[PDB]
């Protein structure tokens, strides 16, 4: 998988593609179609991180994602495209509440 987490507005923001820069997040779409049939995306990257992740997890309200990669955790302020925060991991739990970790 890539690292992505989706806001229930309807944007799964992922980053990267497979090893592409993280530079590419977004997707609020704009339109509707049949179950079987297929759909269109928006285009407006944000990001161009360096650390290569393997986790994405949303904040409990989607909001703050903490992303880990290269073994450290960048958390983003997302809309912000701000680094919400960073450090090195080993293992994790968000305090589910959406306010601690």
């Amino acid at each position: 998988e890539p690292a992505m987490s989706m806001d229930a507005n309807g944007k799964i923001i992922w980053a990267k593609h497979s090893e592409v820069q993280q530079a590419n997040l977004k997707a609020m779409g704009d339109t509707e179609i049949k179950d079987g049939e297929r759909l269109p995306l928006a285009v407006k990257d944000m990001g161009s991180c360096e650390i290569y992740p393997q986790t994405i997890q949303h904040n409990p309200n989607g909001r703050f994602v903490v992303v880990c990669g290269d073994g450290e955790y960048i958390i983003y302020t997302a809309m912000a495209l701000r680094n919400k925060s960073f450090g090195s991991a080993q293992e994790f739990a968000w305090a589910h509440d959406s306010s601690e970790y």
Binding site: D7, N9, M28, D30, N61
Partner: protein, 145 residues
């Protein structure tokens, strides 16, 4: 909101753009957005009087801590009123304390509080709220927290 993107250089303002909604913060409304803290028109009388018509009570008996101070943090500060009738002052310690305290609530009528904090050496205490408005007596006892 309907969220619209910008070009700050020179923009565009167009009918289209799509909504997303973001949850905002709570508003809590206080007992100090509404009140003018005062000194009484007639304390002696008023003091009693306010009892007369108005008065609700709560008692606690305090057995793990013998200090006002916690209480104190919630009360001077929450109500925003004046402690007193010469019954305010305490140094970095003090044996006993009463705040007989004042201000007036919105809608005109007043909200009045007497807090006799009593130290035996536990604290057991009589908090009175007396009011010239009904909604405040129930409120003070809560609000102070």
């Amino acid at each position: 909101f309907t969220v619209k993107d910008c070009d700050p250089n020179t923009g565009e303002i167009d009918e289209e753009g799509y909504e997303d909604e973001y949850v905002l913060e709570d508003l809590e409304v206080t007992v100090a957005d509404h009140i003018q803290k005062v000194m009484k028109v007639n304390f002696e009388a008023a003091w009693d009087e306010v009892g007369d018509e108005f008065e609700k009570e709560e008692t606690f008996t305090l057995s793990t801590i013998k200090t006002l101070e916690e209480a104190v943090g919630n009360i001077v500060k929450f109500l925003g009123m004046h402690p007193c009738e010469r019954s305010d002052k305490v140094p970095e310690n003090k044996n006993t304390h009463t705040l007989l305290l004042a201000g007036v609530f919105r809608g005109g009528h007043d909200i009045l509080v007497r807090s006799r904090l009593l130290l035996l050496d536990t604290v057991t205490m009589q908090v009175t709220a007396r009011s010239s408005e009904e909604l405040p007596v129930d409120i003070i006892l809560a609000s102070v927290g």
